[PDB]
Amino acid sequence: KSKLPKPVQDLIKMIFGDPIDVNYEKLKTDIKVVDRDSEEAEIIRKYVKNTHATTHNAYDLEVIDIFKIEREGECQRYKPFKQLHNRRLLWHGSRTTNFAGILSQGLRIAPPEAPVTGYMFGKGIYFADMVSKSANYCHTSQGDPIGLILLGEVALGNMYELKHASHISKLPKGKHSVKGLGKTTPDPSANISLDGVDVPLGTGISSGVNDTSLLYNEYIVYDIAQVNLKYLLKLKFNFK
Numbered sequence: 001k002s003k004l005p006k007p008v009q010d011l012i013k014m015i016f017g018d019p020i021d022v023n024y025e026k027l028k029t030d031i032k033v034v035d036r037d038s039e040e041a042e043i044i045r046k047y048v049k050n051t052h053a054t055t056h057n058a059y060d061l062e063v064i065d066i067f068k069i070e071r072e073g074e075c076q077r078y079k080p081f082k083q084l085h086n087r088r089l090l091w092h093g094s095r096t097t098n099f100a101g102i103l104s105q106g107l108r109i110a111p112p113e114a115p116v117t118g119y120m121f122g123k124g125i126y127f128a129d130m131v132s133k134s135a136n137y138c139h140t141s142q143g144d145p146i147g148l149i150l151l152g153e154v155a156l157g158n159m160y161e162l163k164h165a166s167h168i169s170k171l172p173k174g175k176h177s178v179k180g181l182g183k184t185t186p187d188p189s190a191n192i193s194l195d196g197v198d199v200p201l202g203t204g205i206s207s208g209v210n211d212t213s214l215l216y217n218e219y220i221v222y223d224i225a226q227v228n229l230k231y232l233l234k235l236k237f238n239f240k
């Protein structure tokens, strides 16, 4: 019998399809249930509510559970970046079958042999500031409507801001990350701070950017150490 809280037990069952507690240990990740009544949960629910894109209208999202996560080794790996400016709490979606690998190994860059199709700024680690842009990568359906999504603190520093696909060979001098500029942005006036990290939970507005290939922002880092995975949400997709 498992000694984990029931929501964590259910998460492990979802991730692994060995005893529950043995599978938990394979993830090398501390997993804590976030209290529904907390400041953290209120912020995260608002981020989900406010940043669902008007063009992603096939479904709406219901948050079932929020977990706080701490990967083994993360404290030391992230330390060089924890003092960089412009650290932002951003979305990353993936198929459920990828999460055992993501939690144990962290987010990784696609290897040389994988196609570059789907990556407009080359192989890196990609995030959104609009929940639905990332939720689309969960590849849920009516028949299979529960997905998992991550929130990471991403150390962006000085962003190399681009509007059209470009597989850059190197970051320019002093730049730490790429930001793809979309036509729509969470309203920047509404940014708040959660534990020293910026949370862009404003409702979507026109960015006023013209001559861009993107409907919505995206953020890319090219060093796996620039990512501090912090929350994992279990989402219900309510298809319309």
Ligand SMILES: NC(=O)c1cccc2c(O)c(Cc3ccc(-c4nnn[nH]4)c(F)c3)oc12
Binding pocket: 091, 092, 093, 094, 117, 118, 119, 120, 126, 127, 128, 133, 134, 135, 137, 218, 219
């Ligand atoms: N994942 C996100 O939340 C996210 C947020 C913002 C922008 C993007 C963006 O362009 C991608 C790209 C992507 C995702 C998955 C695969 C894949 N291949 N095989 N299995 N999965 C891939 F080839 C490319 O992901 C994004």
